[PDB]
Amino acid sequence: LRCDQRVHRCPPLMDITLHMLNGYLLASKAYLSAHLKETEQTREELKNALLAAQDSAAVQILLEICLPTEEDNLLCNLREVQCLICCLLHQMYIADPNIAKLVHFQGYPCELLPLTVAGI
Amino acid sequence: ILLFLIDTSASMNQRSHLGTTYLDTAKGAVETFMKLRARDPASRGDRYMLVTFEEPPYAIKAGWKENHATFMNELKNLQAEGLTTLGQSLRTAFDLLNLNRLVTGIDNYGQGRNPFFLEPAIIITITDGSKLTTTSGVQDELHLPLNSPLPGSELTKEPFRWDQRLFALVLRLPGTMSVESEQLTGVPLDDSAITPMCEVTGGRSYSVCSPRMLNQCLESLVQKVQSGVVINFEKAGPDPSPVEDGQPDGSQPWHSCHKLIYVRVPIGHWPVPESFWPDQNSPTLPPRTSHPVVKFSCTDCEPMVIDKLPFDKYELEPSPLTQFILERKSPQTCWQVYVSNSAKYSELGHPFGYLKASTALNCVNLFVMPYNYPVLLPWRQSFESYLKTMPPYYLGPLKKAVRMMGAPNLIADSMEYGLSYSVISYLKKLSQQAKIESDRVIGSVGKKVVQETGIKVEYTGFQVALLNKDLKPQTFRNAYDIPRRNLLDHLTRMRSNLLKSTRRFLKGQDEDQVHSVPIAQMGNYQEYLKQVPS
């Protein structure tokens, strides 16, 4: 999510990066689950909190990417990128219903409220 | 024993001319009173208690079985928020002071009234100026409520006890300059609703107006703590028969001062039995009085009383000694004293002592005599007929003195009343249970009250949460306690903390220390292989 920042206005590359993000999030979950077993030769709650915070940070970054500009709203690359991000967020919420609650407790700017509700 | 009563009411939030509120000044005055009393080498047995203007479960902050540490900790965190419920607080304090009285034997109400069984207690009742409220309006009477009397309290009919003095501080500090400093050595009265309640017990009520006056009143209050023997005097009935060196004409009649019964527990005998005629069969006992209504008569009546009678030195505190000093302190002469309210079967008062002064003419010695001394002191079947004029139970203590010579009496007629013994152990057990229940839930507050009570104006059961002071959010353990601003940096911090695999991991981000950081406490948990032999 810290790439060249020019792919934000690029639907195909954005979808590729979203697929990679989901894959690497699952890989990080698996890596932590395997690392907590190869240690001490509680920690499970710490790992769960870390994974929840990481998913929440990823969701927040994906939401902040949906911002229009730095300063048509329907026919542009921004629309397709927002739709892809909403699709990934819907998949994440279907996978885990707790990250949605954690993100809503953390909050996000109101400019994304009519987009996530009507997109997810 | 000293029970400080600090209201901590919402009216104690107004700022003085120095810059601190009245509550801060009261706490500072309490601390300086502590450091002043610590100068006298007698503060190794007293115990400090705290009473605030809160609910009965929350009014007491530190009571029995509480050391000085928790008392200072509770007085430190006092918050001034609430109404001025003076009557309920005074009642709670008096009930707290009378928890361990019906179990040890003090005020047994069946065997005289022993003055050598003392439990001193001084109340300060530091409150505001005036305008006390009771959640409905502003009262001007200060009547103590009577809603739930303690088991065994109907035998005194008064909340305070034999030795329970009540001093008061109003803290009437001006807000601009407090420039009233005309009278240097003068401490006037407050003239408020607490003044009669204080004067009834036997203690005055100071009127704090300046910090200098506060220091003066605190330095004058430390000299008014001793054994509590408070008895009331009356002029009746002699019409001021003090025709010894001048002519009488007075205010030194209703003297309700205290007496210093210094020990040599206190040692003494011959107590003031009671004020009524006790019958052999009496289911209900008449309620006693905290202050005995004893009256003196100005008669010489052979003041020379020399015998092997056990001696007593209950020193009387000089408060109304002007009437005695007007007659040259009555040299080599005394005046009898007698308790009223049917001291015998059929008579009005029986002389049982006198108030002879010492040779140094400093104070009154309060020579306490037997129930009827001028007859037994000067057997031809005389003592058997003489022992019928004295109360029955009164044969208890006097016989001990007869033990110094012999033992002619026995336990045949040593019976007060067949009905007085009954219904007494149950009352003592109930009082002990109440004292245990009060001392148990004394520091455990367990408020658990945080809600907004959302009204309609999930239904009828919702309540928004309130801001918790001592929340201690777990940033590493709980993910909900991480705000949005410092989320990525905190995420990396948690990641590095979990992937470090260090020793003795914790869930706190930055927990430096508590409010106190002692040097010896931290140095004790260490090892130093050194002794400095050189």
PDB file of N, CA and C in Angstrom, chain A residues 32 35-36 45-47 49-50 52-54 57 60-61 64 98 101-102 105-109, chain B residues 475-480 482-485 487-488 491 494-495 497-499 501-502 505-507:
ATOM      1  N   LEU A  32       2.159 -15.477  11.519  1.00  0.00           N
ATOM      2  CA  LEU A  32       2.080 -15.240  12.957  1.00  0.00           C
ATOM      3  C   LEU A  32       1.574 -16.476  13.692  1.00  0.00           C
ATOM      4  N   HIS A  35       4.496 -18.676  13.925  1.00  0.00           N
ATOM      5  CA  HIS A  35       5.583 -18.163  14.753  1.00  0.00           C
ATOM      6  C   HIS A  35       5.263 -18.272  16.237  1.00  0.00           C
ATOM      7  N   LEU A  36       3.995 -18.105  16.619  1.00  0.00           N
ATOM      8  CA  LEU A  36       3.634 -18.308  18.019  1.00  0.00           C
ATOM      9  C   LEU A  36       3.752 -19.762  18.460  1.00  0.00           C
ATOM     10  N   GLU A  45      -3.732 -13.729  22.557  1.00  0.00           N
ATOM     11  CA  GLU A  45      -4.538 -12.512  22.543  1.00  0.00           C
ATOM     12  C   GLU A  45      -3.775 -11.357  21.905  1.00  0.00           C
ATOM     13  N   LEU A  46      -2.467 -11.275  22.155  1.00  0.00           N
ATOM     14  CA  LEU A  46      -1.655 -10.247  21.512  1.00  0.00           C
ATOM     15  C   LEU A  46      -1.636 -10.432  20.000  1.00  0.00           C
ATOM     16  N   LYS A  47      -1.525 -11.679  19.536  1.00  0.00           N
ATOM     17  CA  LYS A  47      -1.544 -11.940  18.100  1.00  0.00           C
ATOM     18  C   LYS A  47      -2.894 -11.582  17.492  1.00  0.00           C
ATOM     19  N   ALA A  49      -5.037  -9.327  18.628  1.00  0.00           N
ATOM     20  CA  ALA A  49      -5.134  -7.871  18.604  1.00  0.00           C
ATOM     21  C   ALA A  49      -4.285  -7.281  17.487  1.00  0.00           C
ATOM     22  N   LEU A  50      -3.084  -7.828  17.279  1.00  0.00           N
ATOM     23  CA  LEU A  50      -2.225  -7.343  16.203  1.00  0.00           C
ATOM     24  C   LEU A  50      -2.864  -7.576  14.842  1.00  0.00           C
ATOM     25  N   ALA A  52      -6.106  -7.915  14.185  1.00  0.00           N
ATOM     26  CA  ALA A  52      -7.259  -7.028  14.057  1.00  0.00           C
ATOM     27  C   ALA A  52      -6.825  -5.606  13.727  1.00  0.00           C
ATOM     28  N   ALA A  53      -5.797  -5.104  14.415  1.00  0.00           N
ATOM     29  CA  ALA A  53      -5.312  -3.755  14.143  1.00  0.00           C
ATOM     30  C   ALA A  53      -4.716  -3.651  12.746  1.00  0.00           C
ATOM     31  N   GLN A  54      -4.048  -4.707  12.278  1.00  0.00           N
ATOM     32  CA  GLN A  54      -3.481  -4.690  10.935  1.00  0.00           C
ATOM     33  C   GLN A  54      -4.574  -4.665   9.875  1.00  0.00           C
ATOM     34  N   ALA A  57      -6.055  -1.185   9.894  1.00  0.00           N
ATOM     35  CA  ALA A  57      -5.185  -0.222   9.226  1.00  0.00           C
ATOM     36  C   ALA A  57      -5.245  -0.387   7.713  1.00  0.00           C
ATOM     37  N   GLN A  60      -8.469   1.143   6.592  1.00  0.00           N
ATOM     38  CA  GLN A  60      -8.395   2.601   6.647  1.00  0.00           C
ATOM     39  C   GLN A  60      -7.581   3.158   5.486  1.00  0.00           C
ATOM     40  N   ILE A  61      -6.477   2.496   5.133  1.00  0.00           N
ATOM     41  CA  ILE A  61      -5.678   2.944   3.996  1.00  0.00           C
ATOM     42  C   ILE A  61      -6.473   2.817   2.703  1.00  0.00           C
ATOM     43  N   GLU A  64      -8.960   5.680   2.634  1.00  0.00           N
ATOM     44  CA  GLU A  64      -8.322   6.952   2.319  1.00  0.00           C
ATOM     45  C   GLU A  64      -7.855   7.021   0.871  1.00  0.00           C
ATOM     46  N   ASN A  98     -15.796  -8.918  12.406  1.00  0.00           N
ATOM     47  CA  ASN A  98     -15.306  -8.107  13.513  1.00  0.00           C
ATOM     48  C   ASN A  98     -14.471  -6.922  13.051  1.00  0.00           C
ATOM     49  N   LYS A 101     -16.694  -3.907  12.537  1.00  0.00           N
ATOM     50  CA  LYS A 101     -17.019  -3.243  13.795  1.00  0.00           C
ATOM     51  C   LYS A 101     -15.830  -2.451  14.320  1.00  0.00           C
ATOM     52  N   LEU A 102     -14.622  -3.007  14.203  1.00  0.00           N
ATOM     53  CA  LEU A 102     -13.439  -2.297  14.679  1.00  0.00           C
ATOM     54  C   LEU A 102     -13.185  -1.034  13.863  1.00  0.00           C
ATOM     55  N   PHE A 105     -15.738   1.547  14.855  1.00  0.00           N
ATOM     56  CA  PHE A 105     -15.366   2.136  16.135  1.00  0.00           C
ATOM     57  C   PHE A 105     -14.183   3.083  15.985  1.00  0.00           C
ATOM     58  N   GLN A 106     -13.288   2.810  15.035  1.00  0.00           N
ATOM     59  CA  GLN A 106     -12.197   3.737  14.756  1.00  0.00           C
ATOM     60  C   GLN A 106     -12.685   4.944  13.965  1.00  0.00           C
ATOM     61  N   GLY A 107     -13.589   4.729  13.018  1.00  0.00           N
ATOM     62  CA  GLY A 107     -14.169   5.809  12.249  1.00  0.00           C
ATOM     63  C   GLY A 107     -13.352   6.164  11.017  1.00  0.00           C
ATOM     64  N   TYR A 108     -14.003   6.883  10.107  1.00  0.00           N
ATOM     65  CA  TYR A 108     -13.372   7.377   8.892  1.00  0.00           C
ATOM     66  C   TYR A 108     -14.126   8.620   8.441  1.00  0.00           C
ATOM     67  N   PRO A 109     -13.518   9.455   7.592  1.00  0.00           N
ATOM     68  CA  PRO A 109     -14.183  10.700   7.185  1.00  0.00           C
ATOM     69  C   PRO A 109     -15.547  10.451   6.557  1.00  0.00           C
TER      70      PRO A 109
ATOM     71  N   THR B 475      -3.572  -0.973  25.373  1.00  0.00           N
ATOM     72  CA  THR B 475      -3.305  -0.697  23.965  1.00  0.00           C
ATOM     73  C   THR B 475      -2.770  -1.925  23.238  1.00  0.00           C
ATOM     74  N   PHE B 476      -1.950  -2.735  23.911  1.00  0.00           N
ATOM     75  CA  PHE B 476      -1.377  -3.910  23.263  1.00  0.00           C
ATOM     76  C   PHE B 476      -2.318  -5.107  23.310  1.00  0.00           C
ATOM     77  N   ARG B 477      -3.169  -5.192  24.330  1.00  0.00           N
ATOM     78  CA  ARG B 477      -4.081  -6.320  24.476  1.00  0.00           C
ATOM     79  C   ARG B 477      -5.401  -6.087  23.747  1.00  0.00           C
ATOM     80  N   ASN B 478      -5.995  -4.911  23.919  1.00  0.00           N
ATOM     81  CA  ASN B 478      -7.265  -4.572  23.290  1.00  0.00           C
ATOM     82  C   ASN B 478      -7.013  -3.696  22.071  1.00  0.00           C
ATOM     83  N   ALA B 479      -7.623  -4.064  20.944  1.00  0.00           N
ATOM     84  CA  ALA B 479      -7.476  -3.302  19.712  1.00  0.00           C
ATOM     85  C   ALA B 479      -8.448  -2.136  19.614  1.00  0.00           C
ATOM     86  N   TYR B 480      -9.508  -2.129  20.423  1.00  0.00           N
ATOM     87  CA  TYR B 480     -10.475  -1.040  20.393  1.00  0.00           C
ATOM     88  C   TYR B 480      -9.960   0.224  21.068  1.00  0.00           C
ATOM     89  N   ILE B 482      -7.154   1.659  20.549  1.00  0.00           N
ATOM     90  CA  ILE B 482      -6.183   2.312  19.676  1.00  0.00           C
ATOM     91  C   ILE B 482      -6.936   3.297  18.789  1.00  0.00           C
ATOM     92  N   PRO B 483      -6.767   4.607  18.978  1.00  0.00           N
ATOM     93  CA  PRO B 483      -7.469   5.571  18.119  1.00  0.00           C
ATOM     94  C   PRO B 483      -6.955   5.565  16.688  1.00  0.00           C
ATOM     95  N   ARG B 484      -7.553   6.399  15.836  1.00  0.00           N
ATOM     96  CA  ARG B 484      -7.226   6.378  14.415  1.00  0.00           C
ATOM     97  C   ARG B 484      -5.949   7.147  14.098  1.00  0.00           C
ATOM     98  N   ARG B 485      -5.632   8.184  14.877  1.00  0.00           N
ATOM     99  CA  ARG B 485      -4.470   9.014  14.578  1.00  0.00           C
ATOM    100  C   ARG B 485      -3.178   8.208  14.656  1.00  0.00           C
ATOM    101  N   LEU B 487      -2.327   4.979  14.747  1.00  0.00           N
ATOM    102  CA  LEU B 487      -2.700   3.597  14.478  1.00  0.00           C
ATOM    103  C   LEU B 487      -1.606   2.822  13.761  1.00  0.00           C
ATOM    104  N   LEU B 488      -1.044   3.384  12.688  1.00  0.00           N
ATOM    105  CA  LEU B 488       0.004   2.685  11.951  1.00  0.00           C
ATOM    106  C   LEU B 488       1.289   2.601  12.763  1.00  0.00           C
ATOM    107  N   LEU B 491       0.667   0.184  15.345  1.00  0.00           N
ATOM    108  CA  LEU B 491       0.669  -1.145  14.742  1.00  0.00           C
ATOM    109  C   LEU B 491       2.091  -1.676  14.606  1.00  0.00           C
ATOM    110  N   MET B 494       3.396  -2.578  18.111  1.00  0.00           N
ATOM    111  CA  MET B 494       2.897  -3.870  18.571  1.00  0.00           C
ATOM    112  C   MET B 494       3.564  -5.015  17.821  1.00  0.00           C
ATOM    113  N   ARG B 495       3.787  -4.840  16.518  1.00  0.00           N
ATOM    114  CA  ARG B 495       4.446  -5.874  15.728  1.00  0.00           C
ATOM    115  C   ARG B 495       5.865  -6.122  16.224  1.00  0.00           C
ATOM    116  N   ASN B 497       6.999  -5.435  19.190  1.00  0.00           N
ATOM    117  CA  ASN B 497       6.949  -5.972  20.546  1.00  0.00           C
ATOM    118  C   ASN B 497       6.623  -7.460  20.538  1.00  0.00           C
ATOM    119  N   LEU B 498       5.780  -7.899  19.602  1.00  0.00           N
ATOM    120  CA  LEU B 498       5.416  -9.310  19.543  1.00  0.00           C
ATOM    121  C   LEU B 498       6.510 -10.147  18.893  1.00  0.00           C
ATOM    122  N   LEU B 499       7.205  -9.594  17.901  1.00  0.00           N
ATOM    123  CA  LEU B 499       8.257 -10.318  17.201  1.00  0.00           C
ATOM    124  C   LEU B 499       9.616 -10.207  17.881  1.00  0.00           C
ATOM    125  N   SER B 501      10.250 -11.311  21.127  1.00  0.00           N
ATOM    126  CA  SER B 501      10.411 -12.491  21.979  1.00  0.00           C
ATOM    127  C   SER B 501      11.321 -12.192  23.171  1.00  0.00           C
ATOM    128  N   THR B 502      11.016 -11.104  23.872  1.00  0.00           N
ATOM    129  CA  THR B 502      11.788 -10.697  25.037  1.00  0.00           C
ATOM    130  C   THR B 502      11.296 -11.457  26.268  1.00  0.00           C
ATOM    131  N   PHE B 505       7.101  -9.950  29.097  1.00  0.00           N
ATOM    132  CA  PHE B 505       6.366  -9.033  28.241  1.00  0.00           C
ATOM    133  C   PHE B 505       5.133  -8.496  28.962  1.00  0.00           C
ATOM    134  N   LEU B 506       4.679  -7.324  28.523  1.00  0.00           N
ATOM    135  CA  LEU B 506       3.526  -6.667  29.117  1.00  0.00           C
ATOM    136  C   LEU B 506       2.630  -6.128  28.012  1.00  0.00           C
ATOM    137  N   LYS B 507       1.424  -5.721  28.401  1.00  0.00           N
ATOM    138  CA  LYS B 507       0.444  -5.170  27.476  1.00  0.00           C
ATOM    139  C   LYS B 507       0.319  -3.656  27.576  1.00  0.00           C
TER     140      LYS B 507
END
